[PDB]
Amino acid sequence: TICIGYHANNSTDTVDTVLEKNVTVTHSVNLLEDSHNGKLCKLKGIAPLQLGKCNIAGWLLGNPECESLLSARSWSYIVETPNSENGTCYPGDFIDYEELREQLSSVSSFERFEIFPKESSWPNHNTTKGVTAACSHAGKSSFYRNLLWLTKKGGSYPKLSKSYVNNKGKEVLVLWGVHHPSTSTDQQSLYQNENAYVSVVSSNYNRRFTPEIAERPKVRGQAGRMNYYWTLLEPGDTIIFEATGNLIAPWYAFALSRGSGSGIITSNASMHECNTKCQTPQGAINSSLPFQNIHPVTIGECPKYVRSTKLRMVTGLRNIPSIEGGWTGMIDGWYGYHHYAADQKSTQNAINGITNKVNSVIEKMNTQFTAVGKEFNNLEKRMENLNKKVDDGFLDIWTYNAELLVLLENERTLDFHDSNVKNLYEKVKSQLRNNAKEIGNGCFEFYHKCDNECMESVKNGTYDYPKYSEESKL
Amino acid sequence: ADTICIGYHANNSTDTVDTVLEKNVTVTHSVNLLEDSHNGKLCKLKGIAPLQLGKCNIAGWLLGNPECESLLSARSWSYIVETPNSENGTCYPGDFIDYEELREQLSSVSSFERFEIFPKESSWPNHNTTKGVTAACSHAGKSSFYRNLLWLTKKGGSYPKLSKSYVNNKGKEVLVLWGVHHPSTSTDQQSLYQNENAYVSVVSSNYNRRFTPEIAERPKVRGQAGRMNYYWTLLEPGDTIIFEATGNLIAPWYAFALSRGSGSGIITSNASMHECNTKCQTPQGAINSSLPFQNIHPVTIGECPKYVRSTKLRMVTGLRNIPSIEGGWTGMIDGWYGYHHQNEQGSGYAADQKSTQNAINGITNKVNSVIEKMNTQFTAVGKEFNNLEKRMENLNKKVDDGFLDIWTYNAELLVLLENERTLDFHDSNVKNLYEKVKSQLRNNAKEIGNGCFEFYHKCDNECMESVKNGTYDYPKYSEES
Amino acid sequence: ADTICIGYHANNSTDTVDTVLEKNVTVTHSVNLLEDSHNGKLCKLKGIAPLQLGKCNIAGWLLGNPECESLLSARSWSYIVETPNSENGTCYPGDFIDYEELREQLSSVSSFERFEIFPKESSWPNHNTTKGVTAACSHAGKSSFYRNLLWLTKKGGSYPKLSKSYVNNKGKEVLVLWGVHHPSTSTDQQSLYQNENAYVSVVSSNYNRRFTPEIAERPKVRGQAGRMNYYWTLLEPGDTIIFEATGNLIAPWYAFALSRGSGSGIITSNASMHECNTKCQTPQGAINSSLPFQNIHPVTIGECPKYVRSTKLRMVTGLRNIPSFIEGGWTGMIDGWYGYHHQNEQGSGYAADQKSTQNAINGITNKVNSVIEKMNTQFTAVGKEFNNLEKRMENLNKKVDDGFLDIWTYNAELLVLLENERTLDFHDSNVKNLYEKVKSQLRNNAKEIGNGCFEFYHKCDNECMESVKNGTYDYPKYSEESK
Ligand SMILES: *[C@@H]1O[C@H](CO)[C@@H](O[C@@H]2O[C@H](CO)[C@@H](O[C@@H]3O[C@H](CO[C@H]4O[C@H](CO)[C@@H](O)[C@H](O)[C@@H]4O)[C@@H](O)[C@H](O[C@H]4O[C@H](CO)[C@@H](O)[C@H](O)[C@@H]4O)[C@@H]3O)[C@H](O)[C@H]2NC(C)=O)[C@H](O)[C@H]1NC(C)=O
Ligand SMILES: *[C@@H]1O[C@H](CO)[C@@H](O[C@@H]2O[C@H](CO)[C@@H](O[C@@H]3O[C@H](CO)[C@@H](O)[C@H](O[C@H]4O[C@H](CO)[C@@H](O)[C@H](O)[C@@H]4O)[C@@H]3O)[C@H](O)[C@H]2NC(C)=O)[C@H](O)[C@H]1NC(C)=O
Ligand SMILES: *[C@@H]1O[C@H](CO)[C@@H](O[C@@H]2O[C@H](CO)[C@@H](O[C@@H]3O[C@H](CO)[C@@H](O)[C@H](O)[C@@H]3O)[C@H](O)[C@H]2NC(C)=O)[C@H](O)[C@H]1NC(C)=O
Ligand SMILES: *[C@@H]1O[C@H](CO)[C@@H](O[C@@H]2O[C@H](CO)[C@@H](O)[C@H](O)[C@H]2NC(C)=O)[C@H](O)[C@H]1NC(C)=O
Ligand SMILES: *[C@@H]1O[C@H](CO)[C@@H](O[C@@H]2O[C@H](CO)[C@@H](O)[C@H](O)[C@H]2NC(C)=O)[C@H](O)[C@H]1NC(C)=O
Ligand SMILES: *[C@@H]1O[C@H](CO)[C@@H](O[C@@H]2O[C@H](CO)[C@@H](O)[C@H](O)[C@H]2NC(C)=O)[C@H](O)[C@H]1NC(C)=O
Ligand SMILES: *[C@@H]1O[C@H](CO)[C@@H](O)[C@H](O)[C@H]1NC(C)=O
Ligand SMILES: *[C@@H]1O[C@H](CO)[C@@H](O)[C@H](O)[C@H]1NC(C)=O
Ligand SMILES: *[C@@H]1O[C@H](CO)[C@@H](O)[C@H](O)[C@H]1NC(C)=O
Ligand SMILES: *[C@@H]1O[C@H](CO)[C@@H](O)[C@H](O)[C@H]1NC(C)=O
Ligand SMILES: *[C@@H]1O[C@H](CO)[C@@H](O)[C@H](O)[C@H]1NC(C)=O
Ligand SMILES: *[C@@H]1O[C@H](CO)[C@@H](O)[C@H](O)[C@H]1NC(C)=O
Ligand SMILES: *[C@@H]1O[C@H](CO)[C@@H](O)[C@H](O)[C@H]1NC(C)=O
Ligand SMILES: *[C@@H]1O[C@H](CO)[C@@H](O)[C@H](O)[C@H]1NC(C)=O
Ligand SMILES: *[C@@H]1O[C@H](CO)[C@@H](O)[C@H](O)[C@H]1NC(C)=O
């Protein structure tokens, strides 16, 4: 008696197909990664910059609460906390603030330098008195660390003309502000000139600012407003500041060195001494799987984000522990014989085919690189909605593609196993023409006596029908 | 002698399906996944009637155009409908700053409360409130003005400095609308407002802007050489907005307290409102369908099937309908797979329930799996762009066209692959059923090869049922030769 | 003993295809769905030559830059070509407001008519039309100015108030270009415009803007501390535009009446224009192909195959190529994919079953055509330009292009792999059914060798063998034990 059957084990893995659901299988692999360390890790051995209680504006402007960020020179990515309220301590509007955040997301490191020294640049203006109650630090009134508030000296504010040439060989980010007093008396008290103008002109940048005086609601106990501006100075370019008052002079500037793969994320996780190639706001991921469902925002080489709850693809056979049954005892291979040993050559071909199938799926799913969210102002809702449609639309398609391929391959994988096991049984039948009775349950009843060597010959494929045709019986 | 045949079901069905290998394959059973029927009427969504602007534009509705007075008493709606002939808006010529952006904000507004932010008689005692009428905005034959705006002009030959503040006590976002008038001539400026160099200042906690009137020769639009620029802002709860002006200010007479919702939008439809309720509304009509796809209109409000460009989406649920195994049995109505009976005691066309029931479950899961994968299309809102936003307009068009091309491709391709697989699935089942009979009838019966079996022995009803039930004892009929 | 065999076709084909289960499978016949060949030349579209700017950009072309005088005679084009070094634009330093948006408008413009909106000698009698030459806009060694703009300065030490209007008689959209000059110092302002405080007003029915000149110390660009800001607008048919200025106005000398078309665009190519006509144009070259996909360039003009990142897209149309069921492929059977071999007394030969082969050929042909039909033709796709304060829009546009390209490349490659595996299994099913058809006819008269061949116990002549291939083989005629 020789039988043909398939493998069975103690495996509770369940898969889904198009025709049937929750099919228990002997072997399977999970294509969805759902585990993360929950910590902010170092990227490329470079620590990320944690803003803490500060936003992007407060960090670059030099907010007094953000002085710990001043001594930072290099980072892999920028982390902002959900309660990042310290920016622009003096009320006002940051022009092109969202655009500046986009520019910094491509900045890997900058060098902070004193573009205009406070004591040397302005001898005819008062560099002191430039402190406000809104920007109070340690109980005392203070001001931005990168900006200087210039006021009248000796009751006179002479015309100011300051120029700077970019000798750093890099893009230079220059920040300045224009102050809008609440009353005409406050204008004369601070700048002596009632009608004043501010001019900032470079080779590629030209803008003039006229202070506006009006009754305004108090924000942080300040009726006045400061409008903050920025520009990028190309190497060799000259920027000229011409003002008769209300100018917030640039005390410090940044020489930018551009990189790739950086971004700005909002995370509630804590930084720990770990290194990863994939970082999410919820935690870092160390996985070679094609898909993940942790967070859509990624930094570095990461699996593609999908909304799928489960993505399990079949790599083995159906687990029927009860050919109408899988032999749990046959642990050597997927296909084999009873009276129980396993046919390695047929199993090895199936293993190679399944391994190539799994590798093809991973090949199709490319690694997702840094994808960071964008910020929009109150008059940019249409772009915000258009950006949201793009993100949701691509996520909608990829979730559909991932789930559909798994179901199709699960049905294809199971049919691959059934066809191979039938061919092995039929191969034996072609070897055994009337020498064995066809029981029909996957077993053969030999009319002759088959020793251990006799059985091995059939498995090897070199079975001689004439040799055991003499013992014709019944 | 006695004969048992094996075949499949056939009926009268003209449904045609397409596969990768062949087209227009007639099948016994099929299901349509594409919805192409709509009522052609504007229906209520969630039992809430939509706001139909009629002959009015969005600007005229919020600004209070005299022709838009029927829309003033509106507080709640499910969605906003705009007519192709909705020309009544900024009746006084001018520019509506961020008009398209304001339209986007209203698409996320489910209901607003209209209140008099500044009472006309109480707020401004030092200015003339009765002279604010223009020929362009004419109502009932007489010159009129916007119902939500107040035109302040010179009173008694004097325009004192104006300072008006409002505190948002409504606990919601407050939409404030105002205008700045730009006269045609300096004489017209002095005649309407005492001060020649005049300014308007509108300042809030998050908003600060100053407007300077410009005087120049302009072509007449609606018989008016002057221009009025309309502005808007959202006042956060508890915030204060201050209006400071020395002239040329169109004061905010009425404001709106906004309540945000989800699923709303602005659509352009020529359909008429009727007393009906629906879960899916399109500019062409409402849809009551559980199908995954529709080809009626891409613009949707509520839970809707996904829009595709497909003309037909038919998925196979049955077998091939080829009459005259060289053909299907039209007489066998009981099931998809079955046998024939020729025992001379009673002939019969019968069906194998166990094989058919297993096939039905597999096909039902296939259709349900496809529908589950295709998510319900939610509210899809069109966007408007000004003449200096063509790049944004074209980028939006690529997104809409690009996604539509892929999903139409996905819908058509998936149907074709499963249609070929379903037909191949049936051929495998009938072959397995044929081998099952052959296995039990290992030697007793002859195999003609045409799907029938020629019995060398006699097979009674008990014998026939035994083969069909699977409990056939070949020894019991093996001696008979 | 007489023998009949069943096998498949083989040839000398080294074409390799990929499936999900196995890679680099050599096949007898295949079709390439990816186009990678182009002529390498800039061709005419619909018999209409493209407009080649050469060393000029869009700004220099429309403004009338002196180096762009060959472009002044342009009336019609199919698309606009820009060279990598098109550095001649806005010779006088300044900012071109909404320059990127103006480029988008021209991408839908098929032809314009250049006309003198305001004649130089007639329009302005109270202002000096000759003093308008600068060193930055120098032609032939002497200072000159834009050919489409007129620099108006004070006449006789006086700049009277200016009011000039134009009514659109062209029945088309009219593109009007003008500039506002910003002097570096107040003395230079008075030297050109006697009035110190001046304003410029441009008002139409759909356009209203006022410009206030700004005077400040500025770095020298092309030896000029002053700046000129260039503006544009589209005048609808029948509309009137009025120019009111007291100084610092760069008057429009020439305007363009636009005739809009579809499918045009602006591309950057280093290729050379040749006397050829094509339906598909790319920056690398023209394409004459009916294939659904191409990997040449994403930028296309006209009807083009969809751009994908795939290196190869080869679909199976034939059998596995195994020269040597049956151990190998029969190179001698050239008539069809499936057929028979036979060894009788009067010779041996390879024949093909036409009825079975034609059904497979038609099925494969329908499969290939169905795939090509699903892949839609890519129409004109042109890149967009963004300024330094539009990085978010630039990045958002980049996400759309990269996101869609990833999906379509995935869709193209995945579909090929699925059908290639299905095609190979489709062929094995047909050859197995052919084997069973012969086996069924030879109930007991033949022995099953097991290698795909049948050994006849009786003598089967040429006519007898044709019956087996024909399907009309009579078992009783040769019902003989022979054992
Ligand atoms: C960095 O970021 C932190 C927040 O993360 C800022 O701290 C906030 O500062 C603002 C402004 O100073 C605070 O807002 C104010 O809250 C006051 C609450 O006072 C009550 O509660 C305190 C609790 O300690 C009691 O001691 C006190 O007696 C009161 O019972 C309000 O009274 C304030 O109103 C004032 O301003 C408004 C606006 O102008 C006026 O209209 C009012 O009339 C009044 O003058 C104001 O609302 C906020 O509470 C602070 N938060 C925290 C957690 O401390 C830092 O200031 C910021 N620093 C920098 C440099 O940016
Ligand atoms: C059409 O485009 C071509 C370039 O494709 C352009 O030719 C270029 O013109 C500029 C300006 O005339 C040249 O740049 C100058 O070159 C001289 C040396 O020959 C330098 O001395 C100049 O530097 C001085 O000026 C600067 C600006 O004030 C100062 O900052 C500096 O300190 C110096 O004082 C300046 O670099 C350039 O060399 C040519 N290039 C070529 C290849 O000819 C042409 O003018 C354009 N024509 C039109 C009508 O637009
Ligand atoms: C609301 O919209 C309607 C449009 O349906 C406005 O009516 C239109 O008003 C303009 C006013 O300039 C009319 O133009 C003029 O028509 C007369 C002939 O009646 C002609 O002599 C003039 O030279 C000029 O062309 C326009 O014809 C008219 N159209 C219709 C259909 O009535 C109405 O004024 C708008 N009301 C408000 C408050 O916005
Ligand atoms: C800048 O302005 C401040 C205003 O407070 C000056 O501070 C005062 O300076 C005068 C002159 O030395 C003293 O008499 C006052 O006692 C100072 N008061 C305070 C509170 O500082 C400051 O000196 C000015 N600096 C310059 C360089 O003029
Ligand atoms: C036109 O030629 C320019 C070079 O003058 C090409 O720009 C270079 O392309 C190579 C890759 O092909 C890059 O490595 C260089 O960085 C590019 N910039 C240079 C050399 O300045 C440009 O790609 C060509 N245009 C087309 C359409 O092929
Ligand atoms: C595009 O390719 C097609 C096919 O290769 C060309 O059409 C053939 O041209 C040759 C030479 O004139 C003729 O002998 C054939 O009869 C043509 N075949 C067909 C189907 O038209 C066509 O000329 C090419 N077009 C261009 C612009 O190069
Ligand atoms: C399944 O069997 C394996 C045999 O290697 C054993 O290690 C494992 O603990 C078993 N699992 C369960 C859940 O019984
Ligand atoms: C088709 O079948 C239905 C169901 O029995 C029947 O009502 C109808 O008359 C039939 N018509 C034809 C043309 O077969
Ligand atoms: C399939 O049938 C439809 C409906 O009659 C017809 O329009 C179409 O041309 C047919 N297709 C083929 C390939 O016969
Ligand atoms: C406004 O002015 C008109 C004259 O144009 C006058 O009849 C009217 O009484 C004035 N109203 C007020 C409140 O002064
Ligand atoms: C939608 O159609 C179904 C069809 O059976 C019907 O029962 C249901 O009442 C319909 N719903 C509405 C709101 O018309
Ligand atoms: C195969 O031989 C034929 C002989 O005509 C030749 O045309 C063809 O190019 C050859 N193919 C290969 C791949 O060698
Ligand atoms: C298939 O051939 C290509 C090209 O020679 C090669 O890069 C690839 O590794 C090959 N694949 C296998 C599985 O041999
Ligand atoms: C314009 O200015 C030039 C330069 O001084 C002078 O030669 C010419 O005569 C002037 N023309 C008029 C009409 O004033
Ligand atoms: C083969 O079949 C054809 C019909 O297709 C018939 O005309 C011919 O006589 C047959 N030949 C033989 C040898 O049976």
Numbering used by the authors:
A (entry chain E): 2 to 323, 337 to 353, 361 to 495
B (entry chain C): 0 to 323, 337 to 493
C (entry chain A): 0 to 323, 336 to 494
Sentences from the paper on this structure:
The use of computationally optimized broadly reactive antigen (COBRA) hemagglutinin (HA) proteins is a promising vaccine strategy to protect against a wide range of current and future influenza viruses. Among the effective HA candidates designed for H1 influenza viruses is the COBRA HA termed P1. P1 was constructed using a combination of human H1N1 sequences spanning the years 1933–1957 and 2009–2011, along with swine sequences from 1931 to 199810. To elucidate these details, we determined the structures of the COBRA P1 alone and in complex with 1F8.
